[PDB]
Every structure is written in structure tokens, then in C-alpha cells.
Amino acid sequence: MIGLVGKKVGMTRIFTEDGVSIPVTVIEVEANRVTQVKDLANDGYRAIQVTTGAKKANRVTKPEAGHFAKAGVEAGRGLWEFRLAEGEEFTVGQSISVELFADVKKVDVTGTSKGKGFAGTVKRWNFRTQDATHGNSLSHRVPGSIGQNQTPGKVFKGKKMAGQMGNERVTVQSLDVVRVDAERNLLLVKGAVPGATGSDLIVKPAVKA
Amino acid sequence: MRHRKSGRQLNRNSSHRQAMFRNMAGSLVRHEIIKTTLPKAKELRRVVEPLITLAKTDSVANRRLAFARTRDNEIVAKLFNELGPRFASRAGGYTRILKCGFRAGDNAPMAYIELVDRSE
Amino acid sequence: MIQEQTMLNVADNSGARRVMCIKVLGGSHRRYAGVGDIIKITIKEAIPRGKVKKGDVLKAVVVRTKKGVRRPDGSVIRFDGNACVLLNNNSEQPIGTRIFGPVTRELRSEKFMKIISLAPEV
Amino acid sequence: AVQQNKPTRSKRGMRRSHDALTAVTSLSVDKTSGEKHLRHHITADGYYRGRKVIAK
Amino acid sequence: SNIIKQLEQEQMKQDVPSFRPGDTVEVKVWVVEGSKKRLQAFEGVVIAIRNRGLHSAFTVRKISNGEGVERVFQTHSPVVDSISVKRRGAVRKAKLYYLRERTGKAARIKERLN
RNA sequence: AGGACCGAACCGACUAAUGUCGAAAAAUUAGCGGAUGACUUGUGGCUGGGGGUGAAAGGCCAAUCAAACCGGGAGAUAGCU
RNA sequence: ACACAGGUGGUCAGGUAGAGAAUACCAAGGCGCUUGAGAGAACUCGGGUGAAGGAACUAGGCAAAAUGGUGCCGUAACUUC
RNA sequence: AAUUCCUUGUCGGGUAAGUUCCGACCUGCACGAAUGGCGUAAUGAUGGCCAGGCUGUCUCCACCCGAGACUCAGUGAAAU
RNA sequence: CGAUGUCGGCUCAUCACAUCCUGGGGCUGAAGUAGGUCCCAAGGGUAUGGCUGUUCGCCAUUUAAAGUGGUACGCGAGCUGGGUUUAGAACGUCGUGAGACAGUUCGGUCCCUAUCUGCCGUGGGCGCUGGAGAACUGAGGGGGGCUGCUCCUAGUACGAGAGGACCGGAGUGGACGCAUCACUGGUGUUCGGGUUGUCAUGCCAAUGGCACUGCCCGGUAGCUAAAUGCGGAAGAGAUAAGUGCUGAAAGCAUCUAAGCACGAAACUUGCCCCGAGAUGAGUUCUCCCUGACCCUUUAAGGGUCCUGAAGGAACGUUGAAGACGACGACGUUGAUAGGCCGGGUGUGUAAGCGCAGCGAUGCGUUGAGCUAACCGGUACUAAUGAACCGUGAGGCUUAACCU
């Protein structure tokens, strides 16, 4: 019911007993500990601010380290929030592990995609490339028309043109868990999560059912 | 989009590129210190460091590979007699790079690169 | 990967020798087909006496594609060339008795049991 | 491809607002020689990090 | 990735009877015939071996009724029962892809006796 | 033997792309056609404006041609702008 | 019009491979083409390779790909032989 | 038909499907005998069509190698 | 008319509803199946080829369907130039002739470096009023929404029989989008090997340069599709046609005038992304600064000395981040790169030597030698002590609680 932030390690295969080669993703989920419990009357809405990781001594800043000393926790790398779902309180300091992700079937993965750079229209919105022969001059992969004529007299707001591709928080929904090693604190899920081989991504239980 | 790649093109084609670092290696070993721009110096670490790595192992097999690169027996003779036994203890980098100035005719970032023994 | 205008060899002995897929059947804007689905073929080259003559529109179903198909273990089974087996235009049931060469287990579901039984292996 | 009305002296300057130049902000004084140089750069004499290492 | 290198070796089988490209491999597959689980056998020559840990796989071709039939095989898969090397080939190359062009007499290979 | 064949130099210019305020007021790159002939080329002559020359396109006659350029009639004439 | 990827007649013309003045790498001899140092985006220009399919593209097989060398064997319709 | 308007005429062949193409009917809007008629081997950087081969033309584009584009330094235009 | 480039195709769209499909309904000459006709409904989807310059049309074959129109009969400072519609030429034809003919037939230059508006992306300045670091709430905006087939209910409902469901559920595909590199392949001019011609290292040997990477055969990482996962939704709120309940006006009847309830892929959420420049600039947590002097038209003023914090910027090592800035990681208290050691992976028995062979050349040492970006370690080299910017408790008014 609450999300868990973890680091993508990589993807690999898992052979089943019948022979099905299920491709999994290895998400390490270390000690997710609570740093703040927001309440209705105190702080508006209600959620928990969770962190994980191991940050160095001389990299954590004074407004950051003072926020952790109030919570009585260890300075991880960054902190995120997850909404509480109608009645649940733990403490400020609950080191949640992958233990609760052992009976929830499908989960949701939210992570940042790989930045493809300034990518063209043929790469971004699947625009079909023009003819590469038959007289064509300097216009093989150019987008062509981007508007009608004098009557609309402008280009419509939302026109699919070239720009920055990727490097954005994306969410793949409803992936199935297959195995959890609570001794190693791992998370093996069916399919593929967003990229950046050794970055982070939020794993949350099923919003779709 | 260049993810996880290596090497630096240097606005120069491949045959020209490998003929430069081969020629730049011979200049580095001969005078122990050269003045060149930063990306040429930063890539020269990826050439002569594997060269001095194979220069602390005297054998006819290793001399042929040390001659297959740099194509100069005098540089091969400058190695294996001085730079090999001068560096047969340090298992690491055999060069240091210092930022000196700016190439006056075109404002190019120059950088001194030398060999770390400099005892003469 | 049998899309269209594709010179397919024949597998059975229906009199066909060389056909061409003119339209993949089932699904709008479908590009090609795999080993399990049927297509619509013409007869490009036929046996002299045979059972069908050159220039007839019938339905076929491919059995051996050069791209190959993929078992769930990650294994793929490729062939040397493209091949199909003919079948009647209305009440499918393959027109032919003898079927040359191997076939693939991804044909086995209640209709192509007639094909895989007459096949030698797999 | 070509303009239609002459851009003013106000629009010319506003385009060159972002065309300012950042200079030198803070230099560095070497340990031994006390000569000015850029950060992570050798001195014009030849010192670096309190060491006359290039020996001109 | 030791976290992945851990998970790679708890599924690699231990024997993996050493073969080289050019060999004549007999490989038996656990095919499921609906109810029964009979054990059929595939035969032929290895063309390629993609040696990468748990994802190690190899390609066996088979001249059958004239038409060549190739089939890749995941080595550490449970559907592969065993790998039996019949003949020891003595080819020079590591991938024998030129054998997809030739047929019959030119497809024979020398012996690896040494 | 050849207005013969394949094909460099040389001569020409079918096709495509680049170029189009060019590198060039017609070129470059890759192929292409003649390549002992009605061939091609250097030097020097001769034919001139209602005239020349024209394997004839109204093509060419000094980046200008269904009538060259220069100067003079002449500040033509302009019911038009 | 310029320190202009164009035009400009003749002469000499070596080594290896090669039918050769083609072409590839070199000698004598002469140049690196008067802006460069980085980055390694879209997209443009010149190219390299490509799964399965193989003209389904399109006005059109335009462009590319392809074939290509020597000797021997072998060679149709039609014909002015 | 380099000619046929009606018209993609009609029949036969090629194709899964052929306003183009090939062989023929004469109903020649409005062919016709040196402003030549009808054929013709060879030839053609010629017009139309078909088949094999071959492939990025295309299904549907992907990666890569260089020259610009982009950034800093110098010089520095143009149409309007 | 001191210029608004013409048909068609391509690429890219977008809107209307008089709706082709999917959806919900009324009537039937609606048994069922299958249909017909009409009302509400624009969320999404809505062919491929032969022929033709053609739009169109005809034909072949698919599809749940191949919708009808607007947008200079959308779209040439985006491409094409086949048609038409320049100059050459020819046929038929009208004319004595020069020539003419939506009469055909072959050939036939398509320019622009984007100032502004618009749009897709990304930064700077300053603001938000004490300053800084994170985290967010969410106004609002956008994305997405399609569906075939088989099986099950069921040969059940209906029906003499033949035929043969609605509803609901599940499995499995097509087209579309998103993420990804485990696998399947592609590529991989920075990796290993084979090989032709030639030149060179003095020569043999062994390698190197050039010939498009010379031609090639494979191939780490990274990037991707044909590869592999996943998604459209369920539910709820308010309705549209239509169906009602109760119910008078009009003692009856009646869905409607009061009141109330069902009712669609449409509308509002539900799912995902941007998002406090949302100047209405919100909220929470944390850290930081609590020295003295004069002047003054004594005002939220200016200036002096002394201190400048937390933090930020710069500089430098660099990134699965990136056009540039930005953004992420780290800077000796160090793993951010390079080098190095080991491994992995790819190439496939290196060199040298020994033996066999007239010789080329084959075995032995040897699954060797060499191994690009990959994995795990190691301070050997470069990330230098500083300095610069940022201050010294934060205006006035009223309420509210305690001095």
C-alpha cells in the first residue's frame, strides 16, 4: 500500500521448472527508513518521507543533516514520499525492508528513463521517413508540414515536433513479482523497469487490478 | 547518442587518429615531457600507459608488440632499458598532466604532460 | 516472416511447387505472419497433372520460416527457407496426403492436427 | 528567410543582454612563489601547488 | 555485478560437457507431448557457441531431408537434458556460418585427433 | 579492310545527387557516349547587321539575338503609370 | 571581378603487379590545399553494413545493389549470310 | 495505330487483379502510296511492356564512419 | 495582375456530425439467427495492391469498418514534378499560308542562411519581500481510451424442425503507444584473425602504412527492432436517447410540472506525465546570522570600521546527463575518471624455438597470444591550502494570547 524506493542493479533470466525463461530485473531494496510522518492537522495531507542509502560525512549539508538528527536516522541519499492509504502509522524510524513485498503479486515501477538526447521526429513520435530516392532533395527525415494554411494561421499547441527525448520519470504498470530473497534484500520482477543501469526507481504495489 | 562509449574522435578520422597517438607516443618518450592540448593529453594516457606496462617485461615477444605500436626501434630502445626498469615498482599511472595555458593563435586549452620520474 | 509477394516453397503434395502470399489474413493493417497463422496465396508454379492449376487463389499456412519461431526457453528453431501447406478455401482441412520436411509444435491446436500427423517429425 | 520590419535599438540590446562576459572571478596564489595563477593551472613562472615542477 | 553474479551461478548446471565449434553434438530435449513428457533427441553440428555465463547458448544445425534445420539451445535451461558429442571437429573458425551456404560433400570436416 | 567492336588521353553531355546570395553568372562527384574518323586540336586568315554562317535550333555572331554593340537624330513618342 | 573545386597547345615520362599512358602502392622531385581548438544533438551532404521479405516503392527499377578477368567447352529466333 | 472522338471499343494472351503492352475485328470521328505505303537483319546514353537476377527503393528503418550543424577564439557579409 | 505558385501523390495533420465500425436505445411485416429503419453518441479506430498523371472509378483480396465533408478543392520559404501549362519534334486535322486544335504523342532548371508570430524543447535575470537547502500539496493543462477470434456459460434461451443467442467470464492475436537489452538478431572504420597487390622497418622472419575499414569472416560494451515485458481497464459521480415510480393540474389517464431512481467508449474523476511565474507566487521540516560608530532636509535613508554565516557559485576529475547552459556523482576525511592487478568476453593454437617434410607447410610447447567502452578491487596520476559571492535577528497596521 506504500511504495519502496530501490536501486536497479540489472536484468537477467530465471529458468522455471517447466522450462519457461522468465526475464527478471534485480532491484536491490535496502533499508527504507522513515524520516517524517506528516499528519492531517499538523501538515495538511498524510504521507511518510522515506530514505535509503549511505551518504558520506563531508557531503551531507547542515540543513540536511539537521533534518535527519531530528528524525534520529542515518543520512541516506535523497528522500521521497509515498501517500498513506486510509489508516496506518509506524513511527519516525521504521526501517522497512523487502519483507512486505513477499505476498503482493503485482507491483508498479516508477523510474527515470534513459536520456536519448535531442532526438528527431522519426525517433520520437514514430514519424514515417520520406522517400530516400525518387527525386527527393534534402528532405529525407524532415517532418514535412506542421500546420494547415492561412485559415488556422498558426501551429496548434501540442504539435508533435522534435525535442528532448527521454530523461523523464516514467511508470511501467502492473509487473509481476517472481521471487524475493529477504536475506539479500532483493526484488525480482517480471519484465523491464525504466533505465539508467545503476540508478533508482520507486516500487509500489498494484494500482491496477 | 553516445551512452557508455569511450575514445575521443578529436574531429579527426580513425586512420589519422591512430597515426597521431602513435606519433605522439614517440614524442612523449623521447623528450619526457611535451606540450599539447588537453584532449590530446587526456587520450595519450590511454596509449603510452599500456606501452610502459608492456615495457617492464623484457622478452622478444613483447618487443615485437612494443614495435608494432609506435613503429620506431629507438623508442623501443628508449623503453626496456630506461623506462622499463625505472618503473618496475610503480603499478599504476606513469604520467601526470598539468594545465599550463592557452594556445595563443586559436585559444586552445594547452596542457603539459610528462613522465613521473623526471630525475636528471 | 512471411509478409507479402513472398516466394514460398510448398511442403505438401497438392500439386503446387511455388506460391506467393498476396494477403495476410486476420487483423487490419497486419504486416506479416508467423508459423501458426494462415494467409491467402496464389499459385505461381504447379505440377503438370496435379490437383490445382497455376493462378488459383487458395489459403495456405506456413510451416517453416527462415526467421524461425521461439520456444519459451529462449530457443529459436530456424530453417533454410520458407514453406507452407495448402488448405481448402472454405472448409480448411489441408488438400494433400504427403507432407515433406519437418514442422513446428506451434501448429498443434485442434485444426492443424491433420497437418502434424502426416508430417514425419516434431 | 528575410525580415519585414527593422528591429530597433531596444531589441538589439535586449538580445545582447545574455551576451555578457564572466571574467576571472577569483584567482589563486601559489604556496611558495606567491605568484598569481588560475585555479588548477601552473604559474607563468612555472610553479604549481608550491612546486616549480616544469623548470623553465 | 556480484549481486547478479550470485544469481547467475545458482542456475548454471555443473557438468556442461566441454565441446567446441565443429563438433557433432547429440542433444536431447524434454519435449512435452501434452500429457506425456517423452524425451526426443536432436542431432547435428554446432555452428556457434555464445559463451556468456548463465546465458551461454549454442547453435546446432541439421541436414534433414535436404533442408537444413538450425536450432539454438540455452545450455543452462532445464529443457536440455544432456549434450552428447559424437565426432570431434577440427575447424579453425569459432563461428561456422559459411556452412549455411554449402551442402553435402563440402560440408564434411576433418578429425580432431592429436 | 572498316564513318567495325571493348576501352585511357582528348572531345562530347544521356541520367542522378550536391550546388542555387555557388567553390563556378552551367560547375563538381559517381556512372555514360565517339575514341582511324563526317574525328579532334594549336596558330593565322576570310565572311557582318535586314547582312553573315547555319548536318536547320530561329541556333550562333565577345556572359546581349525573331534582327549585335557603340555614337548620333533625340529631351523619339507615350490618349498610359 | 578575387591568392576562384572551371578553361589552357606542345615536350620528358622511371620501379613492382599489369594487356596498358587504365589502376594500386612508390622513386626522382614537390606539397599538407592561409583559419583552427573542442563537443560527439536533431537534421543535411558523402559513404559502410544489415535480420525476414525481395519492386509490395513509384509517373518509371530513378537511385543504389548487381554483373564484371583470362582460357577452354557451348550457343537460339531471325538474317542483307 | 506517334493517327480511334465515342472508348479503358470488342475478343484472345499475359496478372490474384492490366485505362499501359502484345496478337488480331474493320464500326478508318478524320490511314494510304516519294509532304512516300507496308515490311526489314544490325545498330540506338530512344518510347512502351514483361520475366530472371540483385538489392534499403519499399514493409520499417536501425547502428556506425567522416564533412557541416553546436561551443570557445579571430575575421566578418547578404537579401529585406 | 509594382505576382495569392496550378491537379495528383508523399509527410504531417486537425475540426464538424448530416455516424462506416464499436456503445446505449424505440418500432417492426422483431420467434431465433439475421436484418431493415430511426433517435442519442465524435472517445478512439477507420486497407493493401493491379491499371491510370488522375482525384475518381473498376477489379482482386482483406477488415470490427475501409465514413461523409471543412481546413487557399489543408500541406511546394516541407519534398516530388508524372498531368497540365514555354521554347524542339511528329501524326490526324482546319487553313492558300505563317500556324492553330481540354485532339493525341516523345523530351523538357521547382530558389531562400528564419527578424517577428506560432509551436516543440532547454537555460539566464529577477521576483516571491530575513537568507539558504530539500521536500511537497495541488489550481490547471496534456497523454491514454480501438477491437477480432476461439473456448466456457450452452447446442443452453427461442424453435415442429433446421438452425441457433442476449448477458457475464477467461484465454489468445492484430494495429497503436510506452519502457527495456535478460534472450533472439542486427550494427559495431577504437577488438582478434584470414587474405590480394605494393612500399617500408638493413635482410630472413615478424609486423606496420596505403589501397572505400582495400576486400573479408566473426564479434565486448552502447544504441536499437524484427526482440521481450507492460498498458487501454474495473469502479464511482452527473447525465443523453430511452425506461420508470409515485403524481396532481384535468376526481380518470400521465416519466414531469413538485420530489426520486436506472441510463453510453461521450462529459467529471479513476491511470500516467508536466505542474506554486498557480504575481491568488500555498504548506511542512531543517540549518544559519542576536558587533560597535557618526551623519541626517532625522526618512523602511546614506555612509565608517569590523566581521561575512548556513549555503551558493566558480574551478577541476567526470557521468547509462547532455547541442549549449542546466542536471546527477565526487574533490585526499577521496573510488569521480585514467592507469594498473585479476576476471569476464571475443578472436581461435601468437612469437620464438624443436621435430617431420626436397618444398610449401603440418604437429608439439598451446584452447595459446592478444583482448575497445563491460564486472569486482587497488590512491599509482589528476581532482591543491584558499579565494570570490552571500551578512550582522528581518518593515508598518490591527487582532490574538501571556508579560
Curated annotation (Swiss-Prot), chain A:
Its job: One of two assembly initiator proteins, it binds directly near the 3'-end of the 23S rRNA, where it nucleates assembly of the 50S subunit.
InterPro entries, per the entry: Ribosomal_uL3 (IPR000597), Ribosomal_uL3_bac/org-type (IPR019927), Ribosomal_uL3_CS (IPR019926), Transl_B-barrel_sf (IPR009000)
Biological process annotations from GO: cytoplasmic translation; ribosomal large subunit assembly
N6-succinyllysine modification, residue list: K38
Post-translational modifications reported in the UniProt record: Methylated by PrmB.
Keywords on record: Methylation, Ribonucleoprotein, Ribosomal protein, RNA-binding, rRNA-binding
Pfam families, per the entry: Ribosomal_L3 (PF00297)
PANTHER family (UniProt xref): 50S RIBOSOMAL PROTEIN L3 (PTHR11229), LARGE RIBOSOMAL SUBUNIT PROTEIN UL3C (PTHR11229:SF16)
Name assigned to this protein: Large ribosomal subunit protein uL3
GO cellular component, one term: cytoplasm
Protein family according to the UniProt entry: Belongs to the universal ribosomal protein uL3 family.
Complex and partners: Part of the 50S ribosomal subunit. Forms a cluster with proteins L14 and L19. In pull-down experiments interacts with CedA.
Residues carrying N5-methylglutamine: Q150
Keyword check for Amino-acid biosynthesis: no
Lineage of the species this protein comes from: Bacteria, Pseudomonadati, Pseudomonadota, Gammaproteobacteria, Enterobacterales
Gene3D superfamilies: 3.30.160.810, Translation factors
A single MF term (Gene Ontology): rRNA binding
From Swiss-Prot, chain B:
Domain of life, source organism: Bacteria
Entry GO CC: cytoplasm; cytosol; cytosolic large ribosomal subunit
Swiss-Prot/TrEMBL keywords: Ribonucleoprotein, Ribosomal protein
Gene3D superfamilies associated with the record: Ribosomal protein L17
One GO MF term attached to the UniProt entry: structural constituent of ribosome
Keyword ATP-binding attributed: no
Statement: the UniProt record of this protein carries the keyword Nucleotide-binding: no
Known function: Requires L15 for assembly into the 50S subunit.
Family: Belongs to the bacterial ribosomal protein bL17 family.
Subunit structure, as described in the record: Part of the 50S ribosomal subunit. Contacts protein L32.
This protein's name: Large ribosomal subunit protein bL17
Lineage, highest ranks first: Bacteria, Pseudomonadati, Pseudomonadota, Gammaproteobacteria, Enterobacterales
Gene name per UniProt: rplQ
Swiss-Prot record, chain C:
GO cellular component: cytoplasm; cytosol; cytosolic large ribosomal subunit
Keyword Ribosomal protein among UniProt keywords: yes
Xref: SMART domains: Ribosomal_L14
Keywords: Ribonucleoprotein, Ribosomal protein, RNA-binding, rRNA-binding
GO MF term set: large ribosomal subunit rRNA binding; structural constituent of ribosome
Classification via PROSITE patterns: RIBOSOMAL_L14
Any one GO biological process: cytoplasmic translation
Calcium among keywords: no
UniProt similarity note: Belongs to the universal ribosomal protein uL14 family.
Subunit structure: Part of the 50S ribosomal subunit. Forms a cluster with proteins L3 and L19. Forms two bridges to the 30S subunit in the 70S ribosome, contacting the 16S rRNA. In pre-50S ribosomal subunits interacts with RsfS, which may inhibit association with the 30S subunit.
Function: Binds to 23S rRNA. Forms part of two intersubunit bridges in the 70S ribosome. In the 3.5 A resolved structures L14 and L19 interact and together make contact with the 16S rRNA in bridges B5 and B8.
Listed name of the protein: Large ribosomal subunit protein uL14
Lineage of origin: Bacteria, Pseudomonadati, Pseudomonadota, Gammaproteobacteria, Enterobacterales
Swiss-Prot record, chain E:
InterPro entries: Ribosomal_bL19 (IPR001857), Ribosomal_bL19_CS (IPR018257), Ribosomal_bL19_sf (IPR038657), Translation_prot_SH3-like_sf (IPR008991)
Pfam families assigned to the protein according to its UniProt record, in alphabetical order: Ribosomal_L19
Record keyword Transmembrane helix present: no
Coiled-coil boundaries: none
Protein's UniProt keywords contain Glycosyltransferase: no
Record GO biological process: cytoplasmic translation; ribosomal large subunit assembly
SUPFAM superfamilies: Translation proteins SH3-like domain
Protein name: Large ribosomal subunit protein bL19
Organism whose genome encodes this protein: Escherichia coli (strain K12)
Taxonomy of the source species: Bacteria, Pseudomonadati, Pseudomonadota, Gammaproteobacteria, Enterobacterales
